[PDB]
């Protein structure tokens, strides 16, 4: 009763307090407002289109000079509640990531300190278009930049001063959070003739990539490669499996094509760089080429691919004669070339196969640099 009825009638929040009027002690420098950013969770990542759905605790602070109470308000309880429509609430806009209005971080219950200072901090399910670019894929995986602040007010109606991103990074993400710096600021611009709205700039530098696609995807390559590798070992052990060897090309071919087909599918869902996508398709082509090589190299050669005396001489004639045919073929066989073929298949597989993990490394060394 300590003037309580009278006093909250004095404040009348809505009626006596100007909620449509922001208590910035009138036209001056600004109401000292401060924003605090704490991610509570990251539910979805879209690397390809630079869009992220993430939850944040919108911790907000500013002193409501008309909020200061007396005994039957202040001291009656040095802390009490008052809804959004009865509390000045900063119009915090997610500067480059609010291209998706904020949810339940809107007009929510706020905390009333005793000497005007107020505290409003609810949950924000939001969507953002963070600095992915086609450079959010090299190993550094860029730095996702975001700015928060009270949209409406300027530098003479609002001043917002300034937590790791992995503090509530989602563990079900296909990426890795390496760092998350936080520093506020204020800034005018060229077309504006005055300074204004201060903001929470929070850069998130992350990284991502599976250690799983590598598993089932290179797996078939050394397996498949041994087929093409054996392909050339097999032309020796038994090149006579002509048609059947041919079958395997169809078969290793259809395998190759849609394998690449699964590749862009996951690709579009992921903006993949040009550097990596080529080593994949470049090398399967390496075999594709050698499958075509397989073709020709496997089917490439033009062919390998006194009366009684009179009569039997006829046969010795037919004898020798087609013995020339028979041999016209082994002429083509080309067998002392055999090992060199599969030797100069080994050498190149070694060259290229190495060239890749050689390149793997020559770029694996400098990032680790």
């Amino acid at each position: 009763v300590n003037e309580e009825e009278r006093l909250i009638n004095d404040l009348l929040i809505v009626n006596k307090y100007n909620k449509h009027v922001r208590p910035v002690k009138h036209n001056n420098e600004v109401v000292n407002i401060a924003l605090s950013l704490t991610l509570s969770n990251l539910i979805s990542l879209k690397e390809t289109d630079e869009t992220l759905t993430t939850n944040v605790w919108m911790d907000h602070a500013w002193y409501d000079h008309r909020l200061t109470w007396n005994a039957s308000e202040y001291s009656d309880i040095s802390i009490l509640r008052l809804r959004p429509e009865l509390i000045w609430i900063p119009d915090i806009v997610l500067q480059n990531n609010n291209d998706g209005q904020y949810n339940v971080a809107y007009f929510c219950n706020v905390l009333v300190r005793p000497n005007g200072y107020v505290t409003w901090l609810p949950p924000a399910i939001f969507r953002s278009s963070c600095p992915i670019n086609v450079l959010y894929f090299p190993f550094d995986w860029q730095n996702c930049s975001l700015k928060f602040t009270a949209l409406n007010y300027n530098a003479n109606e609002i001043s917002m001063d300034l937590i790791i991103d992995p503090e509530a990074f989602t563990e079900n993400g296909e990426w890795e959070i390496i760092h998350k710096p936080a520093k506020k600021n204020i800034y005018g611009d060229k077309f504006p003739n005055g300074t204004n709205y201060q903001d929470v700039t929070f850069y998130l530098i992350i990284r991502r990539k599976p250690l799983f696609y590598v598993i089932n995807f290179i797996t078939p390559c050394v397996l498949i490669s041994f087929l093409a590798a054996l392909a050339f070992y097999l032309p020796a052990e038994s090149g006579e499996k002509m048609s059947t060897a041919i079958c395997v090309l169809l078969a290793q071919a259809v395998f190759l094509l849609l394998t690449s087909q699964r590749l862009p599918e996951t690709a579009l869902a992921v903006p993949l760089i040009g550097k990596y996508l080529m080593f994949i398709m470049s090398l399967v082509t390496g075999v594709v080429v050698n499958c075509g090589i397989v073709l020709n190299f496997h089917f490439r050669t033009p062919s390998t691919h006194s009366g009684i005396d009179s009569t039997n001489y006829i046969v010795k004639q037919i004898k020798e004669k087609n013995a020339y045919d028979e041999e016209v073929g082994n002429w083509n066989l080309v067998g002392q070339t055999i090992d060199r073929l599969s030797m100069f298949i080994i050498t190149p597989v070694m060259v290229l196969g190495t060239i890749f993990i050689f390149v793997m490394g020559n770029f694996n060394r400098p990032p680790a640099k």
């Binding site: 449509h20 922001r22 009138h26 036209n27 289109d49 630079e50 869009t51 119009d91 806009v93 609010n98 291209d99 998706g100 209005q101 278009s129 992915i132 670019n133 409406n152 007010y153 003479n156 109606e157 002509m242 048609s243 041919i246 079958c247 090309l249 169809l250 071919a253 259809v254 094509l257 849609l258 690449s260 087909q261 862009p264 398709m281 082509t285 594709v288 080429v289 075509g292 073709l295 020709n296 089917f299 490439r300 691919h305 009366g307 009684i308 009179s310 009569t311 039997n312 006829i314 046969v315 037919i318």
Partner: protein, 370 residues
């Protein structure tokens, strides 16, 4: 104090929320409309759907809100929620394929003698004619017409800023496309009394070069096995059967390709160009491989006494080798050579043609960037 409570009061006493800052039927209130684009997030080039985001900067004057000592001379600039001015319930004649997000019900910047500034960024579901003509290198242009959906230009005039402002002013860097220019022209179709919408032109250029690359490899690599199946005959005539295996294989491959092409244009189709002739190029390798298959088919087969025994022996062998020698005369390799070089003409001709069309398509229809 200077009649502050008074002013303050009278104002809210007499001020009308739901009224237009103009006096009767005339030149009206000249509202300024101008949007600084943020960026764009999705171009459904296939249905001509456009989801972008920009700032709705509106501004005109409320000579009904000019203040006095304390709010006018006291603080020349003060923020106040809209909800109190006629708001262009703007729809887009083509576009405006959906509602406003961060567009209406937000505070505004009110100046001393009545100027009003309202700068809200928003996401808007639009639809421009990017039609099934958003892929030719000559591409096309579109009509983006903004304007209110209950008001008729009679109690306000709309006016623009630049027309060159450009749309690449806030073009999405995430766009698999690119832009040349954004024209802005004010309109009032006379089919309706209501002066209305403003047409904004997109002279769009979208060149995402990524899979047509390994699409080329099929055409050419398939050609590898193709030229190969055309080369395999005088390479390994026994190709006879293995050959057919090749086309089963070759045809299934191209049919699966048939599978990914329709489902991929399924979201970003435009003219057939590429497909038009690769469709022909398709039919070409298709039929060429099948008639070579008929080239393959055309062969109906391929697809004293002591001494008497001798004599009977002499005739046995010789007699049928001519018979199988006849088969030689029948399956000689004249055709293979001739059509493997007709294969030379066909494939290198039809090849250098779409090669050419494609060649002509990227360079020739490129300058209409306007």
């Amino acid at each position: 104090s200077v009649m502050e409570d008074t002013l303050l009061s009278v104002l809210f006493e007499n001020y009308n929320p739901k009224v237009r800052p103009s006096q009767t039927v005339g030149d009206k209130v000249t509202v300024r409309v101008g949007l600084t684009l943020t960026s764009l997030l999705i171009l459904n080039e296939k249905n001509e759907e456009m989801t972008t985001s920009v700032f709705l900067n509106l501004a005109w004057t409320d000579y009904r809100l000019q203040w006095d000592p304390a709010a006018y001379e006291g603080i020349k600039d003060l923020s106040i929620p809209s909800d109190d001015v006629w708001q262009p319930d703007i729809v887009l004649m083509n576009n405006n394929d959906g509602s406003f997000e961060i567009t209406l019900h937000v505070n505004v910047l009110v100046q001393h003698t009545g100027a009003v500034s309202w700068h809200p960024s928003a996401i808007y579901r639009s639809s421009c004619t990017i039609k099934v003509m958003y892929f030719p290198f000559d591409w096309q242009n579109c009509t983006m017409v903004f304007k209110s959906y209950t008001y008729d230009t009679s109690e306000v005039i709309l006016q623009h800023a630049l027309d060159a402002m450009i749309n690449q002013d806030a073009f999405t860097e995430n766009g698999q496309w690119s832009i040349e220019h954004k024209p802005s022209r004010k309109n009032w179709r006379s089919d309706d009394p209501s002066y209305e919408d403003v047409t904004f032109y997109l002279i769009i250029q979208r060149k995402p070069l990524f899979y047509i690359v390994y699409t080329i490899v099929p055409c050419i690599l398939i050609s590898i096995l193709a030229i190969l199946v055309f080369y395999l005959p005088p390479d390994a005539g026994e190709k006879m059967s293995l050959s057919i295996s090749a086309l089963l294989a070759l045809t299934v491959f191209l049919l699966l390709l048939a599978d990914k092409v329709p489902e991929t244009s399924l979201s970003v189709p435009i003219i057939i160009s590429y497909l038009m002739f690769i469709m022909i190029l398709v039919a070409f390798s298709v039929i060429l491989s099948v008639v070579v298959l008929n080239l393959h088919h055309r062969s109906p087969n391929t697809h004293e006494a002591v001494e008497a025994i001798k004599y009977i022996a002499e005739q046995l062998e010789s007699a049928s080798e001519f018979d199988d020698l006849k088969k030689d005369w029948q399956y000689v390799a004249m055709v293979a050579d001739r059509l493997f070089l007709y294969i030379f003409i066909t494939m290198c001709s039809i090849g250098t043609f779409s090669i050419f069309l494609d060649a002509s398509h990227n360079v020739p229809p490129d300058n209409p960037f306007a």
